[model samples]
Target: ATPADWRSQSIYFLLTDRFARTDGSTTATCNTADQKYCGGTWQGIIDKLDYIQGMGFTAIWITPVTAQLPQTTAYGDAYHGYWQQDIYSLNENYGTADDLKALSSALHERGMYLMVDVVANHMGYDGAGSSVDYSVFKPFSSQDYFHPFCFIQNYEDQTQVEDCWLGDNTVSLPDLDTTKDVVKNEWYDWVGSLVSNYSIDGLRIDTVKHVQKDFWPGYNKAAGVYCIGEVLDGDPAYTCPYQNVMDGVLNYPIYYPLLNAFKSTSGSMDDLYNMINTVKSDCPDSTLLGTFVENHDNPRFASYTNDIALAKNVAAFIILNDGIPIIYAGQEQHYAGGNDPANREATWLSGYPTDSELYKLIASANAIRNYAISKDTGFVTYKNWPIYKDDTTIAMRKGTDGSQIVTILSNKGASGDSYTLSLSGAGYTAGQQLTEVIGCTTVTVGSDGNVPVPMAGGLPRVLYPTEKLAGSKICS
Candidate 1:
């Protein structure tokens, strides 16, 4: 597992073939019909690193680059990169081994990290339901490498979930029998070589819980970098245990509650507060987990609530909240697709709008987060101080007493209407001035060291120490 220091980065997740096309085959060949590959290549990503880096992301997590089934599945193509057919080769559909090496180099040149998606539970199929050749899978080329042909029926049964097939028919993914000593040893060598071969910074393990609990320790040790797993469940009890196996799991436990808090008319903002507290209490370190609003598997946040202000608020919350921030590609472009392929819209459709509302919001908030942490790693050292919380509003402070940011966010936006909100008794000096970093508003401290903030919303009035937020870092 990687050390917790990696928590400081902000990650951007993009599908390889859907992001850009180096070859410029812009037509429907890069189809999303059943999630097949478009012409998106590693070269495409290399050409557009500026678009992501421009949004202030410090890292990029791409779909698995391992070789996939040469044939298409009934679902369409393996364009999403999750279906791995070969353990050692790069996906020729995306790029060559040299191309991947170049992508990693380009990211590191800009000081950004690369996290490659990996699958350990299963390998791709020819859609004959594992009736065909395993010879293409170099090292382990036999039925003995996989679990006995059976479907995963009972999710409640840990044994069934871990050791059984994930899908049915031609799309059925043959689950690996990870319990065998032979299987474990081969994986260690393959993964260790993979990391060194490409200078990989991290690994995002797919179907993490599908493998036994004991399968991860060796895998994590072999990779020798930050390894985050996809447990896919939302229960804290289920999610928290996986943290012990890897650096962290995606923060799915709190993800649903956050969506409810910001997207629903009746949902309480206090629910967001309670979820954060719950994760902290249950997990080893909430700050080390991946914080996100939407991904390839779920509906887009904007599809849930078209309100741009609320979307911006959600972006700000995830960026400033504990854990590393991960923004799915096209999120900044405000793509609002409802389901899987739809949610996985191409970035080219919007021309990667850098001036969009969500884009600017993410850039500004990320800048603040990056700057705040630079001065004091204390930004994520402890739980945020919840100064205020209600069904429609939330205000909290993060960082140490000397340098902290207090953010006041509302569902019923300020909408250009100013309010004299209070930061009364917050740990700050008397007569000190609080400057809103994302807006032009400022407030003066009362004799009692309380601040009377004046700001309009439709945005969060995020305030920080005037000295810490100086220069090109603060907003216009």
Candidate 2:
């Protein structure tokens, strides 16, 4: 069944080829630039479930599981799983069909959901688009199943974006003719069977905007699960529309502004603040969106600035905010790779350490969020209220009145000077004691219901009511 309460789940996303090996070797060499398979298997992920669950993530989003074109292209191998060749067959590099089922069962045993990334818009092919052998593709094994070969030159044109192919001459992702009833029906049937066969609870759809907007509603209904699409745009107007079609979309509109606001101290926090409001107003339910700082497509947040303090703030904001939090694997370990293959680093290289500062912060942040939800069922539904915003800082409060979590984030690097912030509208009463969940320090609400937050070492602060911290496992 679909995970209807997905809004309350925190997700840990990983690329299957780069996560872990079946041998569970921490010393395996993974050169990201090579862009080749590193032997990570579904069993490897199964073995490491405890490490992921320890971070308080309730769900995991994996890369596309379908088979890709066999031969290595001029660009690289399909290790990242975006390139698709056969929808009917599982990528043998990951595991056998039963192995994949075992992974799903294992997640369900621990009360976790499995969100698989899917590519339905295109079928991957090697060589020039003109010379493609359509017979090799499964199910859609004919020229009539795909759109005519045409490289997408102008992404601004909606027709070209939807109808044209994604890749260049050396390799091509042949766009599926979803406008045809035959093709659409095939996809709908395939996705429904795939979900049922593997017990997939949700879907993280790839290249969503590359297909017509109307194609999704039917596709979503067929899948019968929570679907979050990758729109890849930074505008709320462009990205939020996908929310109407699919269950949610990657919060790219806020993602761009978040990078600008937190990458450096000089970035505009007001831009991030305004974009947050824009997305909330535009999207039907902003809480359903996937909130993330780094993903497989973009450069690691640490690539822009290795300031651990700033990274902590980014992590805190993502986890404690309104939307469903998504932490890219290796993000907690401070993987500082740049773009595409570089950003898709091996999670095993970090040895899955629990002692990392960012890792600890993420765990604490999730704990606070989980605690809020436990205390109040309306926690996920409550919108985050921005109580403070400035050039370097933005503070927001989430959850109901008594169960609120106030988060204060700053882009100021580790060397940033300490100061105090007089934050109002935190939904706290006078004389109430709030505990900084990460630091485990106490702060009191003023006579006017304003909380005076002391910022030290530029670290992010998460304040939960002191009374609620008893069984949260945060400070204790």
Candidate 3:
């Protein structure tokens, strides 16, 4: 079993359809009934993986590989793996069995973990209620196997929220009949085997909010692997209930409040700290959060925030702070899009510089965080120095034994771009190198351990001390 702490690793999340395309034909990238398949196969994913590796990520997340319904719906086909007719079939939209295995092997070769998104919550809806048309499948009849149709009339009511169908009209992804002992056993064992036999390090459970209320404990017990489930709702208080259902969840509530708090006009680090503190207190397992600035479901951080510079700054903060840091695909290219299909566009179309400043900056964030986690073992402590949300400035520090202090974050925003800002209230030494990892800028640490960067330019920076130098050589 992969360790629980493995979920906290740096994650590069990908939308399979939008990430990359194989050079060859349509067998893998065969067009769905609705959208043109740009032909992004598992091999396609493997081809561009250096982009991910270069950015310093240790883990990767791809959308579900399961088969989608053959017919087009009013909303379109299930291109992103949310809609499915069969659990066993790997979507031709990606690739065949060998292609999937290639992806798995490539990831392991790179020393990167693979996390496949699994939609166990529901099957796609084709009719009026939460019903499926299984004719798409050769032998499996959907009606006979599915739960009776039920609509969630009251989402505000906890029972309904956990019991009813989601995505009301557009492909009503039916809530699973997890209440059936055979279904539960099948679901658990299938996913458990997928990870163990295939070497998938972890899983991202899609649409976990609508599943049976009691199903999670059994589901969790059954999988017994490193995993993260999506509750999808934004309110932290609302999403927290999934802890009863699964091991971890995408940190959406924690994500947005931090966004609001860092919006220059209505934001502050103190407020951000308070928000995290409340989450820390209420959620017994704060470590399960998937810290992120933007995801597949939301607007691009660069587009919504209106500044790639500030986006880089904020993104680095989430990567370094507590929880697993996950980056959606195209984010490395700094693809700027604001909505659904836009956010869903392929990275190749973004026209971003292949080797740009932002890419390197993100690369730095990943590397330093990797270094921090592996190095700051038992005695490490986290202390928030100060967060100037109004200026979009966040400074977070990690300290360990033997005078090691590294602050990982970005300060590329401006509330007013006023006076100088500095990091202190901890150990200090003169002549020490205060190197900003993102910018590669070196500043002198004065007698009091203080340094300042020009806030006007809004450069993203993550400060990390190089490993300790012992006598003549470096300590690994």
Candidate 4:
């Protein structure tokens, strides 16, 4: 069943092929440049449940599980699981049906949810569109089931973006003619069964904008679970409309501005603040969206600037923001891969180190968030607003009066000089003692209701009321 309280979940996203192998060999070489499967399995994920949970993630979102185009193409193999050929069958490269079930059972036993990525926009064919053998695909095993062979030349044209194919001559993704009753019905039926058979709690629908908006309402209803789509646009006006069609969409509108603001000191924090406000007003519910800085499709945050301070600030923003936080597999380890295959690095290569600075930071941030939720059931519903914003810093607050989390982030690189930010309108009482969770430092609010935040080391700070830190392991 879908977890109705999914908004409270903090998801840990991973590529199944690169996460871990069934053998759990950390010494195995997984060169991302090769663009091939490294033999991760469902059992491997089950083996590492403790690692993910230790970081306070309540759910795991894995790559697509459906069978991919078997043969390798000009780009690479179907290791990332995006190239789907058979919708009804599981990708044997990852594991068996029973293995998947066991993984789901393991997650449910630990009170965690599973969110599987689904690609309904197209089916994979590793050749020129005109040369495709449609019979190899599952139920939609005919050329008529797909749109005419035409590449998407102009993405601005909605018709072309929806009807045209996505790949080049080497590996074509046959766009499904979703307007046809047969295609729509089969998709709804397949998705419903997929959810029920696997007990999937939610879905991460891929290339959502590539399909018509009308295709989703029925599809979402058929699945009977939470669905978050991938509408890869940078404008809230364009991206927020997908929320009406589905439960939520990935927060790409904020991603661009966020990266620009946090990548360096020269980046504009005002841009991020403006986007945050725009998204809140434009989207139906901003809290239901997925908040992330890095994912499989885009380059890692560290790729833009290798400074640990900037990366930490970005991590803090993603986890403490007013949305379902999603931490991509190797993000905590500071993997600096860039673009498609390069960005999909193997997690096992990092030895799953728990002591990494970012990993510990994430664990601490999640601790505060979970503690906030424990104290207030409406914590996730509370929208965050900026208390202060400058070129180098932005302080945002979430939660209500009694239980609030104030996160101050700085884009200044590691070499940034020390400074103090006087934050007013943070809703803190005069003379109130607050604990900085990151460094476990104690600070007092001024008599005038202003909080003097002394920023040094170029790191992010998460402030919580000292009185509320009783049960929270953070700063205890």
Candidate 5:
């Protein structure tokens, strides 16, 4: 039940490498802030917990916490942390071990949760800041135990795939041969302790597909918490395997089809529903997948999805859908940058615009979602509108009479159709007015609980139950 509460919460993501700026060195002063660190620290994040909690995020995922080569004269290692130099040590550049504890404490005070994005896959390759070239490789440093160097030319070879340089190849990041008894024992000793050390709520395993499949059961079992992995693939065949080894996966399947719906070809609700059904039937834990429109690796939802109108609809879908929702920082800012370094930009540090329409929409959607879960009300699906592969219109209704929510999406024109909404699953009376979350408008459900939308021109309209509704004895 405790873990279920976590899966039901919203996740606020920060590139630990780029969230806040604490000590002058916290931003990775060894290199240019743009290249190495743009001033984000654990303390820096702690200072802003109030603002984060205010946004209604119940949980957060900070980047890797491992130490990197102290100096990066060249491309720098501690910048993104995928380049790990040390596994057992903490990044003094980010803060000390105590600072991390302080951060965990800050989150607790606000009743928020935290999940550290650990890079157990590998450690730093070169020294930090203006002092070196490619020869700076050092893998035998942290107790000298890692899966030795092996460049995987064939991404198909599972062995090579599991143990190879991920990027640049300069950092000798040994894929700890979990098959080795010592390696497995060490992980259970070093990384596993962090669960109790931090009293954490979950784990988001990175580069899971690259790790040997056999390693998963032990790795996750040792962690003993809600373990979510980053599989990135959209197909069930590729992603479902992770759930066997993890509690959840980032739902890339949910992301891609949504993009297609907003296109001239087909980004339809039918595709969305089909994909949802695919996960539901195939994955062992459908409710565990992290649903979202964009993340650190993908393009901004608006640029490719055609701005907020579509992004908002997609957002509505994520929070309203069966799984959890994730909003990478700067998404609320409508930052248009894509793919890491660019997409990894920090959330605005101060002076957040109050008139941010995007923030307002997300907050409202989040409220409805959190309420449905809190109230323990099942999503009663009424009539879902038509969505042809060639068409972009979307329609779906969710909620009991105590909390009815309606969603509508159109890529080209408005849905101008109106009908009586008869909800058998959520018992609705013929003349009771239905309130919409987006517009705050009230309309009545007809004899069969049907209601007409009268929509127009690419608007993603949605409705939810108001405070006035409760305990009306809704029947399926």
Candidate 6:
């Protein structure tokens, strides 16, 4: 698939070390407290492609595969694939280079895309800058290739933010001097060849905010594929600017608001509604943005709220939202790990539960989205407007060119008062029948073209025109 095809994809993001062990070692051999490798491999991913593809994911975003430091750090080890040592070589911990290629080929053969995470800001650290030897990294053997060692004390200051170290006193990873034209050119060549070598259809760029924004276009041009930068900040002003430099950014601005509303007691649904509108007005393209609920960086959604209904509601919102939906590995099984290494649970322990309610919801939603987009080209450019939003429930519609989907989400878990909502616009007309795919509930369009929607027990209600559900099992 081409870069533009990413807009229609639903991505499954996984950490290679925690996804599955190729040799089937499910014991507690790897120490989580130490933050070391847990034994997942590229062959493991290749073996279980059905686990992801069955959930209707069209793309998979694995953690970085670059070779890392040979020994353990003060924090733990380079098992997470973040601490890069050799840029030119694949991490031996994952698998052989042929195994990686075979995984990519398998994905393409199944009509799916591969999105590999990459780091450009820093290299793996041994100790302090003075104690470290700069001759280790490929093509960056000199001290001039790196920025002077300084911790990023002020995020507001661009100089410190872009050119400083990330880790603490014990582990100080050196930051690359991306400001130099030579550094930029080297990165362009390195990443370009990396993608081409592995048949990487897209990239999830790490630490985008820590680099000069101007350097990205050239790098992206060289990679020649879709790129979603991790603009870690939650502010739209901070994250949206990277969209100008790269193809899209992980929609952090929306992600925080989504968790707050669904997970926290003091959170508001209005916050989520306002954020979507804010980004639509602020960002360049919402369709290409990477929409996600939980990732390896943050606590699991189940950790915040164990309510399965709320989880289902949140999943529905993301899968049908304006961006590419990325479901983190083990999220469907509701892995309730609270922090970094804990959040990165092994899916093998979950038994790769394919029949979970969350899995079914994701599959159904993706099917609906793929069907809608294929039937109407204008579906990609559909306009979204609020139908109604109260403190507990929010109703909205996304529609274009005779195609419409009315969405209802609620936080009241399986025990809420049901109220009728008037859903009017686009394809809505008197006597038209719309079917909710989950419960197979069908509502009639009143004479005023307003369908009175009844919310279903804190779960989401996605209403499609009756004719659109011709072959769908739920509609039957």
Better TM-score candidate (2, 5): 2
- Candidate 1 Cα misplacement greater than 4 A, ranges: 23-31, 128-132, 413-418, 454-457
Q: Quantify all predictions' global Cα lDDT against the true fold.
A: 0.81, 0.89, 0.66, 0.90, 0.64, 0.84
Clashes of each: 3, 0, 1, 0, 30, 0
User: Residue 410 deviation, candidate 4, in Å?
Assistant: 0.5
Query: Can you tell me which runs of candidate 3 are displaced by over 4 Å?
Result: 5-8, 24-36, 134-145, 262-270, 378-392, 401-419, 429-432, 444-454, 466-476
Candidate 5 lDDT tens digits, 1-476? 13465666788888765666764232243222356666678888887676566566788888877766665535544666666555667777678888888888888888888887865565555522222233333333333355655567896677787776565444444555666776667766665787777777777788888777777778777887777888867778887887887677888776777667653324565777677667767777667778777777776765564455656666667666656778877667676665544666666442444357667667767766665656743542222222222255556555554555666656562332443322333344565666665555666666775555545445556655444445422210
- For model 6, where is the 10-residue window of minimal lDDT? 24-33
Tens digits of per-residue lDDT for model 3, 308-372 = 56666677767766667888877776666676655676765554344775676677677666665
Candidates arranged by lDDT, highest first:
4, 2, 6, 1, 3, 5
lDDT of 6 by residue, 1-476 (tens): 44578888899999898888887655646555768877899999998899899888989999999999887877777888888878988899899999999999999999999999999998887677667788888778888999998888887898899988887667778889999999999999998898989999999999999999988999889889999999998899888988999998999999998898777544598989898888888888887798898998899999998888888888888888887999999888887888887887887777777889898888878777777777777775664566566788767677574577778888777565676666555358788888887777888889887778786567788888898767755455
Off by over 4 Å in 2: 1-3
Candidate 2 lDDT, tens digit per residue, 1-476? 44357988999999999998999999898888887888999999999999999999999999999999997888788998877878899999999999999999999999999999998889888888998989988889998999888888888898999999998888888889989999989999999999999999999999999999889999999999999999989888888888889988999988988888888888888988888888777787888998998998889999999899989999998998778999999999999999987998899989999999988999899888877887788889888878889878899888888888889998887987979899988889999999998898999999998899998888999998898777556787
Model 5 C-alpha lDDT versus the unseen true structure? 0.64
Q: Could you tell which candidate, 3 or 6, scores higher by lDDT?
A: 6
Better of 5 and 6 by TM-score: 6
Give the least accurate 10-residue stretch of model 4, judged by summed lDDT: 1-10
Candidate 3: the clashing residue pairs are: 261-267
After TM-score superposition, what is the CA distance of residue 81 in candidate 5 from its true location, in Å? 2.5
RMSD of each: 2.1, 1.1, 4.0, 1.0, 5.3, 1.8
Q: In candidate 1, which residue pairs get closer than 3 Å at backbone N, Cα or C atoms, i.e. clash?
A: 17-40, 30-38, 127-170
